[PDB]
Amino acid sequence: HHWGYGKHNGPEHWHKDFPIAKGERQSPVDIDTHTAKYDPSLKPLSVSYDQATSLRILNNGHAFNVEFDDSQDKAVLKGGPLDGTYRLIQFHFHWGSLDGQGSEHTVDKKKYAAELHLVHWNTKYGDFGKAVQQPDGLAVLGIFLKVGSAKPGLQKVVDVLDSIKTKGKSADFTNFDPRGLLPESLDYWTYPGSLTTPPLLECVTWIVLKEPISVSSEQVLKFRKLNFNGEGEPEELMVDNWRPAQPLKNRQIKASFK
Ligand SMILES: [Zn+2]
Numbered sequence: 555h556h557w558g559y560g561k562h563n564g565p566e567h568w569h570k571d572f573p574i575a576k577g578e579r580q581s582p583v584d585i586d587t588h589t590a591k592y593d594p595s596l597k598p599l600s601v602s603y604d605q606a607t608s609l610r611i612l613n614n615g616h617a618f619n620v621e622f623d624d625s626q627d628k629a630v631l632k633g634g635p636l637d638g639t640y641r642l643i644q645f646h647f648h649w650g651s652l653d654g655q656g657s658e659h660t661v662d663k664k665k666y667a668a669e670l671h672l673v674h675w676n677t678k679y680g681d682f683g684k685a686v687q688q689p690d691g692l693a694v695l696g697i698f699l700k701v702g703s704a705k706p707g708l709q710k711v712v713d714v715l716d717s718i719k720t721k722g723k724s725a726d727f728t729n730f731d732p733r734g735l736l737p738e739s740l741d742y743w744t745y746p747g748s749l750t751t752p753p754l755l756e757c758v759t760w761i762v763l764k765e766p767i768s769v770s771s772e773q774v775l776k777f778r779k780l781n782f783n784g785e786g787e788p789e790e791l792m793v794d795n796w797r798p799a800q801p802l803k804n805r806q807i808k809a810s811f812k
Pocket of ligand 1: 750
């Protein structure tokens, strides 16, 4: 009885094994655009992904992660509300069984078809495992996906998913450039929050971009053919791997733009 996204082990159960589920700075949240405060003190984000080295893609039974070499400052995020340099370790997505749900964060209660998470850790803490124990340890860039036109830069990801269909499977995944996943604008909302899967630690500065990217229905269809299970246990499709919005409680969302 591990955690997952079903009736009997899904997000409403997580608090029994991970009491921080009901904590004060849980994610995701609904971003109320009329209540978010423009903060002209916020700098532009600086994304330096020119030297990124992807290594591997894997199905971990809750999502698929693309993992990067984080042994040096090769793909980093700086600026914005951040102090210091945050190194890219992995990205993954959350998505739905249908196009009208899938994102974790919502914008004035609107759900998108999926959500991309680029996970970065603060180099002052030396490694990811020490970083997750700190209130400013991680920075996650969240990018919404809507269904319309194809995103060419995502196709390389979609084509390998056949090779990692079940939990535990991995494949070599070199020379992927994450710059092909960014929207045009880097305007953003930011708030302090948590990992959205167990162990749900409250170590994340969230940076959620205003502008969604478009993907095609055929591209998102392929995400939905993955499996939560291992080979061959009974087939459970990897769909609806998102946590619902949590209470904002004592937190302000700030916007980089008006
Ligand atoms: Zn995520």
